[PDB]
Amino acid sequence: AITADDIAVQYPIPTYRFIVTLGDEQVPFTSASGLDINFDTIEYRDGTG
Amino acid sequence: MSTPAVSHRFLVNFLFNNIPNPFDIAFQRISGLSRTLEVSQHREGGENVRNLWLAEQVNHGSLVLERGVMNASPLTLQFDRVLRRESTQWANVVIMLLNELSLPVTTWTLSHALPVRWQMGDLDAGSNQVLINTLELRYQDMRMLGVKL
Structure with a gap:
């Protein structure tokens, strides 16, 4: 007994159903990848540790 | 050894x-x-x-x-006075290495060091680095100590 209104809140989301709005229109695509958020890194060491 | x-x-x-x-x-x-x-x-x-x-x-x-450019220490406030020519005070500097425990294995012990040059790092829009400033002293004598000479 899980009553699929609970699946819409608790279970994860699959990748195969997606829409891509590109500007003022929707275009049907097959794949979509590369939407990362990547940072650089700054360091500093001194002689005391 | x-x-x-x-x-x-x-x-x-x-x-x-x-x-x-x-x-x-x-x-x-x-x-x-x-x-x-x-x-x-x-x-x-x-x-x-x-x-x-x-x-x-x-x-x-x-x-x-x-x-690095950090909070104002008593040494960057002192180079600011000497390079503004408000003082010409110099200091006795002691530099020493430390072994694994805490112990000083060599010591260099400079005398009458005078602040002579400040050099700021580059400001660049794509850089990813800490702003490092370069300090430079001229001393009169030098006397190395320690057990690892």
Whole structure:
């Protein structure tokens, strides 16, 4: 007994159903990848540790 | 044989006469202390096969220091006074390496060091780096101590 209104809140989301709005229109695509958020890194060491 | 000394742990102590407390400041990149004796070559008349080196005058190097732009210490406030020509105070500097425990294995002990140059790092829009400023001192004498001479 899980009553699929609970699946819409608790279970994860699959990748195969997606829409891509590109500007003022929707275009049907097959794949979509590369939407990362990547940072650089700054360091500093001194002689005391 | 005992293990040689690595070069990534070091303390620096300063003692000015303006400032009543001796302060200890962490640096990144102490450059290195040289000490040259400045010989001169003489050429004799009948001697063509040997050389003759005559000792003159000991030349000491310079203490170049690097650290990041951090909060105002008693040493960057002191270079600001000397480079604005409000004082000409100089300090006795003690530099020492540390072994695995805490112990000073070598000590360099500079005398009458005078702040002579400030050098700021680059401001660049794509850089990903800490702003490092370069400090430089000219001292009068140098006396190395410690057990690892």
